[PDB]
mmCIF file of C-alpha atoms in Angstrom:
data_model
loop_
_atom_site.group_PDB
_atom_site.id
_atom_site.type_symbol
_atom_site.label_atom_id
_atom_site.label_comp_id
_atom_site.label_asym_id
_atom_site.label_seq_id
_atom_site.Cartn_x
_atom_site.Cartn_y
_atom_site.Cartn_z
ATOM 1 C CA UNK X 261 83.330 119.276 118.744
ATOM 2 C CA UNK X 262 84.809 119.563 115.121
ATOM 3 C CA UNK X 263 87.115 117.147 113.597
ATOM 4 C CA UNK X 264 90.552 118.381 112.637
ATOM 5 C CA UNK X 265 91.551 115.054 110.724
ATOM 6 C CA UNK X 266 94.661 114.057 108.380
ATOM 7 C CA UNK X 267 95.509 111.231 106.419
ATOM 8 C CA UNK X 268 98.936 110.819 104.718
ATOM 9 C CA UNK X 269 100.628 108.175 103.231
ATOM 10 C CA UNK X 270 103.410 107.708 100.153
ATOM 11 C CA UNK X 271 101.826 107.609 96.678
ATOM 12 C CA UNK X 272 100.029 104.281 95.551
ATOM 13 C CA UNK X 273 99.046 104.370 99.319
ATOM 14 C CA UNK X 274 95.097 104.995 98.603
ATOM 15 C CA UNK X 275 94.549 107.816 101.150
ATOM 16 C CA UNK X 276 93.184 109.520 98.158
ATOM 17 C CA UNK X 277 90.327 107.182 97.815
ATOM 18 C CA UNK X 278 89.861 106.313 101.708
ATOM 19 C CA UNK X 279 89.237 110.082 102.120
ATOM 20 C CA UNK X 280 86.674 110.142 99.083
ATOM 21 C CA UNK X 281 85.218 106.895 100.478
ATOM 22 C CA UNK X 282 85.304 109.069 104.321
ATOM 23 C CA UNK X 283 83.391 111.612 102.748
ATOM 24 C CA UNK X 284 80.745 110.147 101.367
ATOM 25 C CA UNK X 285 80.256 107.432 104.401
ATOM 26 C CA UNK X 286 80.577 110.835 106.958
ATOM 27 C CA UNK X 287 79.271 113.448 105.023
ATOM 28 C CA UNK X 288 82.425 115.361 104.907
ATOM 29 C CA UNK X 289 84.085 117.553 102.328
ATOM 30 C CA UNK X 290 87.074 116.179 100.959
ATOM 31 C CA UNK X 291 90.048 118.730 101.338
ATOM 32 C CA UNK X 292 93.377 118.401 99.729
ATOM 33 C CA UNK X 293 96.075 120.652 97.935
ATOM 34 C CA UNK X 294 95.487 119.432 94.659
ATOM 35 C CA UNK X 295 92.023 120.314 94.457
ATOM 36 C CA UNK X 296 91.895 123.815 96.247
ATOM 37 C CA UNK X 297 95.160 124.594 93.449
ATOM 38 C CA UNK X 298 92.700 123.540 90.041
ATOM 39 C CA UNK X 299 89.109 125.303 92.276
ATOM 40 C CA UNK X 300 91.659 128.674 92.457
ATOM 41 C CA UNK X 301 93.530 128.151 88.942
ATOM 42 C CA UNK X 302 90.425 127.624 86.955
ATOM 43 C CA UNK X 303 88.956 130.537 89.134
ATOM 44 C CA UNK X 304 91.746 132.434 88.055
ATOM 45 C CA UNK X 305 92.138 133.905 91.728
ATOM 46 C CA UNK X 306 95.750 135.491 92.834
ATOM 47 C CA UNK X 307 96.992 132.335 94.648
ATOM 48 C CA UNK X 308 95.372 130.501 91.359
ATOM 49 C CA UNK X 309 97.343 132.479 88.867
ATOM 50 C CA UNK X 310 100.746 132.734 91.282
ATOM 51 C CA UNK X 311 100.852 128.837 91.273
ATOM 52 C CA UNK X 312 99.592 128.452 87.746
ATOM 53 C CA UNK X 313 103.002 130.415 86.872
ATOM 54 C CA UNK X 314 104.861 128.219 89.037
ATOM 55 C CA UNK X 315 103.518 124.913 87.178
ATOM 56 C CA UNK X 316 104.144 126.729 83.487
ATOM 57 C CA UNK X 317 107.746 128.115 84.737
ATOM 58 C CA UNK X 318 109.519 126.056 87.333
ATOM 59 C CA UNK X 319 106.888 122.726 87.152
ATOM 60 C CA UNK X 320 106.582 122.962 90.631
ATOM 61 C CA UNK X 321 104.291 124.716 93.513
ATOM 62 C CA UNK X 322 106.548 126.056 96.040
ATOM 63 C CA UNK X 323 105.622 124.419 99.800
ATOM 64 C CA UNK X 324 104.546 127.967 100.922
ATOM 65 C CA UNK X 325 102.062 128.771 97.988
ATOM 66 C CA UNK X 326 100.330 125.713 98.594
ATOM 67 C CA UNK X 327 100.540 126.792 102.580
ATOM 68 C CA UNK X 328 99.109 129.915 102.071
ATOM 69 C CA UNK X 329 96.018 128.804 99.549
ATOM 70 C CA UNK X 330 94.907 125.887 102.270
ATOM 71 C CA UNK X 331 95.140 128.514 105.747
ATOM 72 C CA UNK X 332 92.860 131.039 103.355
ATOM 73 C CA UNK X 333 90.621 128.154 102.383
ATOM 74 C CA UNK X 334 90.245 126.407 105.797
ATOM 75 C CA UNK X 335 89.669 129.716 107.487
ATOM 76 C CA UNK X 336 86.504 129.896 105.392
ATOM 77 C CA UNK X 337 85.631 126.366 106.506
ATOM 78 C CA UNK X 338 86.352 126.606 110.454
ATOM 79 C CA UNK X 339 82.515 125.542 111.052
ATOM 80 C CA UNK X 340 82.472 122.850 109.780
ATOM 81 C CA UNK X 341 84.615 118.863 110.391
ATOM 82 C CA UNK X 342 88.135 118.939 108.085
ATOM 83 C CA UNK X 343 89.350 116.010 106.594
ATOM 84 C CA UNK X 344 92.543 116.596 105.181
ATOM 85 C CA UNK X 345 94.242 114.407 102.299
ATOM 86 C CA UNK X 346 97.993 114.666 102.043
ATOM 87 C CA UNK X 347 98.666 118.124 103.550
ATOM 88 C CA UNK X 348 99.984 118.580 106.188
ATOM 89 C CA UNK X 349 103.137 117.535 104.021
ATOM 90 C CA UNK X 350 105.981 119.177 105.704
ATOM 91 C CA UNK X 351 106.745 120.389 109.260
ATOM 92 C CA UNK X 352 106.499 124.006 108.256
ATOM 93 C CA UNK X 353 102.918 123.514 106.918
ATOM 94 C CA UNK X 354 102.296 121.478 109.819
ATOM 95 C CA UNK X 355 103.105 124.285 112.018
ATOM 96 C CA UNK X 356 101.094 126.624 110.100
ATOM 97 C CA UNK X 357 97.989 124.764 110.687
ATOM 98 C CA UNK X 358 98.473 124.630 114.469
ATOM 99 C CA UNK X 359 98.183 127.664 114.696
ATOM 100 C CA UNK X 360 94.116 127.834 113.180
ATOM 101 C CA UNK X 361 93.362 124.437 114.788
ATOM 102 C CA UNK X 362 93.562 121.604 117.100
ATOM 103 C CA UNK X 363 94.226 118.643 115.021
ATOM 104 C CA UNK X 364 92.411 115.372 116.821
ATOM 105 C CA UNK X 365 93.090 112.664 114.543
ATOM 106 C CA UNK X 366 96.299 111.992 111.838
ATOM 107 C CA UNK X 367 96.253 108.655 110.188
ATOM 108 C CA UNK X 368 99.276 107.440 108.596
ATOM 109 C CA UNK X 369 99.238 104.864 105.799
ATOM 110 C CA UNK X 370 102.654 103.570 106.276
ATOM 111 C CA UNK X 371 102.438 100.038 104.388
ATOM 112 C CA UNK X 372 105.733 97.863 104.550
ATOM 113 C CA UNK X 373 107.918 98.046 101.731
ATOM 114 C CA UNK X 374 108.240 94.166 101.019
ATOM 115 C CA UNK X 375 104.289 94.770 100.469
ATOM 116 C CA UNK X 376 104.731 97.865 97.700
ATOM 117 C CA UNK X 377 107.566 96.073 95.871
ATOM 118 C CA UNK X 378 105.546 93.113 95.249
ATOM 119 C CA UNK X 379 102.879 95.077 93.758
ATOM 120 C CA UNK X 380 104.760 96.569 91.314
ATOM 121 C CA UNK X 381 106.691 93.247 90.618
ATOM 122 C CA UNK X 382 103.940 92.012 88.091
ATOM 123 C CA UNK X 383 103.923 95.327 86.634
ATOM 124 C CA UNK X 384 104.508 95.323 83.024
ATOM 125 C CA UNK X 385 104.339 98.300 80.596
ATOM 126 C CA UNK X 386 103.839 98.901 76.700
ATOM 127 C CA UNK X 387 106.348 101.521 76.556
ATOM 128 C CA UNK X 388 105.460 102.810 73.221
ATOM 129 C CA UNK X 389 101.936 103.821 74.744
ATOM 130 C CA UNK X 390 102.655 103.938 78.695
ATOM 131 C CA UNK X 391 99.921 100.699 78.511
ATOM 132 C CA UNK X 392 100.344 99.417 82.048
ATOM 133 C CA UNK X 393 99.286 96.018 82.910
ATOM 134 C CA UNK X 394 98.976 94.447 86.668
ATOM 135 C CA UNK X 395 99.235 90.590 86.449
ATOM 136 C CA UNK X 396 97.235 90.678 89.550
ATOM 137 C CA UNK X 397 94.229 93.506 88.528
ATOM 138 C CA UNK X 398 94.839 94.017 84.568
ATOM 139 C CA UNK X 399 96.376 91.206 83.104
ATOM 140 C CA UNK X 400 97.337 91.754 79.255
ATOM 141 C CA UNK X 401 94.669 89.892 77.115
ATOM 142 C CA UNK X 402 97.468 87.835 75.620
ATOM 143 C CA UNK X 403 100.431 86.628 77.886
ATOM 144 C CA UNK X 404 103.734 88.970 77.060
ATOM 145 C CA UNK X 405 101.706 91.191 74.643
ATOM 146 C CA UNK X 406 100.031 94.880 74.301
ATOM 147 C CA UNK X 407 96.364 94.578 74.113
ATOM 148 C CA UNK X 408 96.136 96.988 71.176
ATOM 149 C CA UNK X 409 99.179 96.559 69.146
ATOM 150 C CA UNK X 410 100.427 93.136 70.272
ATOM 151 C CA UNK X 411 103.901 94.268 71.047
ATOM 152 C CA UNK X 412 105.886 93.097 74.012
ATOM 153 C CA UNK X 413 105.448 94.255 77.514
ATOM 154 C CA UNK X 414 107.896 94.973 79.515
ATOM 155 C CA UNK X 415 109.531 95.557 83.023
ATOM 156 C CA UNK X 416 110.620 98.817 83.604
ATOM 157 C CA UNK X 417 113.150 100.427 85.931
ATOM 158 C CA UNK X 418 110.587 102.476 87.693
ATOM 159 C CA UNK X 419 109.174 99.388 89.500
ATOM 160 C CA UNK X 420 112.061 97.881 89.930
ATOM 161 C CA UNK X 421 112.569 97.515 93.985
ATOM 162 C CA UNK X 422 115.898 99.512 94.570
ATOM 163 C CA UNK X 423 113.989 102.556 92.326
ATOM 164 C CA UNK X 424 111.111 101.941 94.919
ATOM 165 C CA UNK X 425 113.174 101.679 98.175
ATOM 166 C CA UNK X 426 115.261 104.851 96.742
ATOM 167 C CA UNK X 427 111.335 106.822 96.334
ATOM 168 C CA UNK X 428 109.878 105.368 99.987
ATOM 169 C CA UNK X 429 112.827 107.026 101.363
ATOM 170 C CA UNK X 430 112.429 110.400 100.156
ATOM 171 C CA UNK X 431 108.722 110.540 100.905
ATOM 172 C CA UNK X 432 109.473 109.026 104.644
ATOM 173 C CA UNK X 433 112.353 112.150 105.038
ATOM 174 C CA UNK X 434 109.969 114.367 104.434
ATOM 175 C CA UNK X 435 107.310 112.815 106.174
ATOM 176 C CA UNK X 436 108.950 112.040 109.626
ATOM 177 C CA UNK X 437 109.159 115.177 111.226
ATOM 178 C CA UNK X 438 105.522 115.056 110.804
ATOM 179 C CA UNK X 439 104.798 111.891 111.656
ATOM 180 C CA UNK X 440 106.850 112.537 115.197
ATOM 181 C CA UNK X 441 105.048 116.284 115.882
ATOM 182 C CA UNK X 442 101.600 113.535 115.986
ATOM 183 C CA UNK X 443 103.323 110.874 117.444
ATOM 184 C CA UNK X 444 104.254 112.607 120.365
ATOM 185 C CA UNK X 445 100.570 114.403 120.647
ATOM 186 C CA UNK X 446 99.109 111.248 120.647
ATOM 187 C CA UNK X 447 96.955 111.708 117.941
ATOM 188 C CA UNK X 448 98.533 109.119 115.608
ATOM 189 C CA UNK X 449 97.267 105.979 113.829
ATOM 190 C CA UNK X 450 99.554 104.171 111.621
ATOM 191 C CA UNK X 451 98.654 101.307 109.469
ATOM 192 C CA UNK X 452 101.530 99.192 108.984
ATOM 193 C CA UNK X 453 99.766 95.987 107.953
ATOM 194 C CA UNK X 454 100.359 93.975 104.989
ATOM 195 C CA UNK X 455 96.449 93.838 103.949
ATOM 196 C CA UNK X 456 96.165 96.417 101.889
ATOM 197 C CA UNK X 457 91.979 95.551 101.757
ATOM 198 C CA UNK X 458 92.252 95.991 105.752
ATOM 199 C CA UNK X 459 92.890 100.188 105.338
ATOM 200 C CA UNK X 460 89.351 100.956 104.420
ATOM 201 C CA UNK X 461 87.703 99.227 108.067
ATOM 202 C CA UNK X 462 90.466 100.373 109.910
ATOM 203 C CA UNK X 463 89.942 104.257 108.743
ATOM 204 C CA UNK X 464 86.484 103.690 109.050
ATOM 205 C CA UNK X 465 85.981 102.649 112.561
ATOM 206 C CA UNK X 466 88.550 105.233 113.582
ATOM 207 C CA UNK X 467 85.954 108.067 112.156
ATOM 208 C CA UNK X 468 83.237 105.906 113.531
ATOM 209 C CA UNK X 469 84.670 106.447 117.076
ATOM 210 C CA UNK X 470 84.448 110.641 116.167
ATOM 211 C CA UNK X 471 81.565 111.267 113.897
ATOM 212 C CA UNK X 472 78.389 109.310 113.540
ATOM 213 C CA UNK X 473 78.216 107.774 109.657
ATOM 214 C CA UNK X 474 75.622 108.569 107.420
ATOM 215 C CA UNK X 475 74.839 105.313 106.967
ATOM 216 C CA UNK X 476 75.807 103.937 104.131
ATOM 217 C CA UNK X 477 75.340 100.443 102.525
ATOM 218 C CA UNK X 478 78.319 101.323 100.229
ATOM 219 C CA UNK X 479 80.608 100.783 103.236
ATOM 220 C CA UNK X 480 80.677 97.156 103.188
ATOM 221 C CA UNK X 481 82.026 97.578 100.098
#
């Protein structure tokens, strides 16, 4: 009757804007951790001013604080279809939201690596300014130079591909022991193309199977 629906994927994956595009084209309220924390710090509630501590102190939000604010938030949601951005992110939390619903649909954005790498391959920075330029998107205005101070770009370590093989690896440690609990439920989609332009239909017609669209001419695109 109600969705229960998840999307995860590494960062630079664009769940983040597939579930904004989701809720608009499906009328659905776009949940995720990060939001709920800024709604509850700016409110100043006790969660709020708990994590707000941890951020100032530690520069971190422990797993279980960020547990605890979304099972308080999506109990006071349980009418209505959940579309969840990037949480569940570990097992634990996982678990935890078992327990207050029957998830129906997890979509997993798990683009090769070959395909990342070469994306941030004609990545080049004004380090000075953090200036980033994409060849491909953003190209500097003058080959080899800053736009604003006409300094040299350059490559940085960040992007480099073992730095980016070393990153994929963390987030897919943490990530497979949820990825398997979903697997095995068979509630699991996971994009592994290498057209990155093909994630937006292929969420979309996986909703479209659930939910009727509100009909949209901003789907296409």
């Amino acid at each position: 009757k109600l969705l229960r629906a998840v999307i995860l994927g590494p960062p630079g994956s664009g769940k983040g804007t597939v579930c904004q595009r989701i809720a608009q084209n499906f009328g659905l309220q776009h949940l995720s951790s990060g939001h709920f924390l800024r709604e509850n710090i700016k409110a100043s509630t006790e969660v709020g001013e708990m994590a707000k501590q941890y951020i100032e102190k530690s520069l971190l939000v422990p797993d279980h604080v960020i547990t605890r604010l979304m099972m308080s938030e999506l109990e006071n949601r349980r009418g209505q279809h959940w579309l969840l951005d990037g949480f569940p992110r570990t097992l634990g939390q996982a678990e935890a939201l078992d327990k207050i619903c029957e998830v129906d649909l997890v979509i997993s954005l798990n683009i090769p690596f070959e395909t990342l790498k070469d994306r941030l391959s004609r990545r080049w920075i004004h380090p000075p300014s953090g200036r980033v330029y994409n060849l491909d998107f953003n190209p500097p205005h003058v080959h080899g130079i800053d736009d604003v101070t006409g300094e040299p770009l350059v490559q940085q370590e960040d992007d480099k591909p073992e730095a980016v093989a070393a990153r994929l690896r963390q987030y897919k440690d943490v990530a497979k022991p949820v990825i398997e609990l979903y697997k095995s439920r068979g509630v699991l989609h996971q994009f592994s193309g290498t057209e990155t332009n093909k994630i937006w239909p292929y969420v979309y017609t996986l909703f479209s199977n659930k939910i009727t669209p509100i009909q949209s001419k901003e789907a296409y695109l």
